[PDB]
């Protein structure tokens, strides 16, 4: 019945019903006017004609390597370009946040209730005739059918950008601090009330959990020593609740900030590294400040590790994923004379697009062994048997799977892929092409334009009939990749703005935080400003093994 | 022992210990350098030479009435000046917030824990030799002596700006949505987790309380009709928890958003008016949108009432308090091309300065009756006896007390004034002159300069010895007022930046919220942009009695 069901308002105009059979578009500050906000103002037509497409820009950033290495060696210029990268992404995210799974109009409940993931696009109204609004059939195609025909892996498809398992598990570990779906409430709800990079996955979401994980001496976290090596403490020692199957022995129930990180030894590898890093920064700070107590050493270390994480995520992780020859830079000062909101609300669509399970290999290869999924899950004895050094060496060599390009979801996690489809529908997501328009991308005009091939496209066409009815999540995994890239256009163009806010939106990047005294002085500040994935491993893993996010 | 105990860093430099008996000042972006950040950069010397004092600017704003009358009638000019008013206040508030009662250094706990009031100045460290740091005696003077000698009212001193009881109860009602101290935790903690103007004092702080207050028809709040007049519902009917003495009959236990508003009929008067306003706006919205459900009608009305509140607070309330001839303007668009953070954290010092109890008369005069405090408190039968119209007419006629200038705290609330003092100390507030420097005011050099007189000054000198040991709260109430004004310099220069962030920092003032469709279209938008204390009364009180925040 809802007259806004067909999504009539274009260019981020807002639709409002004005009766049972009429609507009105609010074109305020869109740059467009007219009934559906499709008539561009004069300056808008200029800006449209000038603005290059994301595929054009991507080409430039990934070619002319000779030029980029000149640019990278000129501080002033590199800073200027990075400033552009930061601000060109800015306009896409609503901050303060707006919609969520229950609210397709702005409300105080949607703004104030932090238990919701927010929504970049409002949900399709309950009384719309079709799942996408008015287009398509009364029901979407069978999710198991979509999954089997175009998502499940046949042969393992390796990532051509060379992403390795250090990368894959870093992605899983890093993102699971702000993707923490509260399944008791439903898929549109989160337990990550900090809505960003607060490192609750190391320190715990609550004060009570944090205090159970702390040593309360020298700012440090509790730990145990097994075979001369530092690991996290146990559940028995801390009374911290963790998720473990009943057959796991008490001595192998490791306690960390995030309750699910006992799921896979890969997560536990990173939890151990970051635990070691915290206590390392504690030693440095105590050295610098013998007059400091446990509480301040702890708090200042946590601020520094938040810094290191953002540093590493931008200059190593995102740097690898982007494929750019331009060297990204973590530098909060670049936004100080710009308009920017130092806040963030985690979007449901950010969670959804980040289900990068094709990354996972068919086996996990550590030293000379090849563990199946079944052997790998919930088995930290693997970590104890081989050690961190061997883990890093092995995972740095093992190639991860390609995410875009279709048919590369391992069958071991087919239930997760199927739920991504089912839960996206349950949360009433708009169509793929609605999300492309929301992020300034041209809508795809056929399934072949979407995939770049003919077989999966034909299968998708038999299932969905209309390209305007194609769904966001499956589309992301079948999209035509950029040339020799891990991702297609949609993943990058949706992911970048969400990411930007999560990283630069952190309070430590704001002017009142970004100064040496926040971090215990110039020594603490320098730990943030020199962090890299390589120094993280080198300082905290015996033998200082070489590491990287790509295979060699 | 802490080397930062003497507050050595000037001009908002941050102090950090570097050993047991050494410190370092972080002068980053202060405009100053050198050991205590007192050596001004070149651009700083210039801005210093140009920037006029607050007493000078205030003179200009409260004189040249003829000139202001020209300016007020030139839309472009009036807008431009309000823009400066808004932005000249910005640089004073930390946003994202920094300190709180437990953290004198920046930390994730202080940033993230919303149960704290934030702090404009860090607390004095526990191990400082004196309450103010290093100056003064081992203990501050007896709070009872300070209270009795310079705060307690002898004769009622009327406010020369003509503030009335409509103003006083509006102040109490409005501020008590974000000053809501959690006494179970301590004075530095709040129950107002929204930290601003969310109208939880009407709608309830929690969802469960909100649902108990709602009718779930037509977006409306529950109400009762007594003698043909609309009042809040009862505790018996709603199961909403309220604070009442045991002797209060069930028919008189009104249930409203804020649990303490049964305290005085003055608060209940405003609770009734806003209840009436919410349901009135529901009627208007239902007319515009017959297709809307209860939930959207409720949520949109709440957003509109948030809008009206901020409008009335700026253009009537702050307009009256300021004494300015320039006509202030509520217009979010004025900040859209400015750097500004749409967020707020309620400061402890803001709470402290807003204890405006000298406002209160010795008796409350309604029609021909005169109620004592004992007769007035927790007595809603007074509201029923006289009705809202008579309340408005009476409170519009009765003069309120002057707040600065000393000796005008009503004795009936002396226990509250003594607690303001004792709790400021318990929260380890820094000295008056420290807070003055923090807000770019010149420190006082004697008690006579503070008071502008000789008697109270001599009393204060015998108590405190050193002006640098004078405390913030008592100073506010004994301070020399502006000429025929209600407040002294310190009250205004501290209150304005806090107030600014609370009002303009609201999400509905952000670009993505500030458009007609947020408020149900142009009709809802207009309700916000035409609101006034007079229209609030006229739309909701029988007879449309004249009202004002000043006596006529
Ligand atoms: C960063 C990419 C990434 C990787 C490498 C990854 C690696 C793996 C992995 C191999 C070690 C296995 C067996 C799984 C299995 C799961 N993943 Co991921 N996942 C990943 C991205 C996600 C995201 C994003 C979610 C949603 C998390 C949420 O909402 O809480 C996720 C959720 C899941 C869930 C459901 C969450 C729940 O119900 O609590 C299962 C099961 N998984 N994942
Ligand atoms: C203009 C401001 C204003 C007015 C008119 C006002 C009018 C009155 C009034 C007149 C009938 C009476 C009997 C009181 C009595 C009190 N006020 Co005020 N108060 C006011 C500003 C405040 C502020 C600010 C606080 C602190 C509130 C908090 O933190 O909860 C306050 C707190 C109190 C408290 C302590 C609350 C507690 O301990 O939980 C009492 C008692 N009172 N107040
Ligand atoms: C945020 O929103 C959720 C969803 O409405 C609230 O959860 C509901 O809470 C009520 C009681 O307040 C329960 O009866 C419902 O069963 C809950 N629903 C779900 C889906 O969990 C939640 O309480 C809100 N949080 C806050 C702080 O207001
Ligand atoms: C915000 O800070 C307060 C003060 O530290 C926390 O309250 C304490 O919580 C501990 C552990 O839960 C209790 O044992 C104490 O009794 C509490 N103290 C006080 C003074 O209330 C509060 O839990 C924090 N909030 C969050 C979300 O972490
Ligand atoms: C300041 C630099 C950050 C801004 C990034 C903006 C643009 C970058 C360059 C370009 C491409 C990003 C690649 C993938 C998007 C998905 C997920 C991102 C993962 C990252 C995450 O999880 O946050
Ligand atoms: C956009 C306009 C708002 C900015 C105000 C900034 C400056 C105004 C003009 C000048 C003087 C304000 C007067 C008193 C300060 C105390 C309390 C204020 C009570 C108000 C409150 O409680 O918030
Ligand atoms: C792990 C694969 C499970 C497939 C079971 C369902 C069959 C539908 O998948 C079919 O299989 C082939 C895949 O190579 C493709 O050629 C067909 O296009 C596809 O329709
Ligand atoms: C856009 O406007 C045209 C006429 O201005 C109208 O026919 C059309 O239906 C509108 N769009 C949608 C999706 O309804
Ligand atoms: C757990 O890992 C060990 C290697 O340390 C392996 O021998 C064992 O089979 C694994 N357990 C399961 C149930 O797969
Ligand atoms: C300020 O610096 C001066 C020297 O510039 C020094 O003598 C003094 O001790 C410092 N201030 C304080 C409060 O110590
Ligand atoms: C309450 O107010 C009424 C006036 O309506 C008055 O008669 C009564 O005495 C008051 N009660 C108390 C306890 O003061």
From Swiss-Prot, chains A, B:
UniProt membrane topology term: Peripheral membrane protein
Glycosylation: residue positions: 36, 113, 379
Triggers of expression: By cytokines and mitogens.
Chain positions with S-nitrosocysteine modification: 509
Catalytic residues (UniProt): 176, 354
Predominant location: membrane
Family: Belongs to the prostaglandin G/H synthase family.
Primary role: Dual cyclooxygenase and peroxidase in the biosynthesis pathway of prostanoids, a class of C20 oxylipins mainly derived from arachidonate, with a particular role in the inflammatory response. The cyclooxygenase activity oxygenates arachidonate (AA, C20:4(n-6)) to the hydroperoxy endoperoxide prostaglandin G2 (PGG2), and the peroxidase activity reduces PGG2 to the hydroxy endoperoxide PGH2, the precursor of all 2-series prostaglandins and thromboxanes.
Protein name: Prostaglandin G/H synthase 2
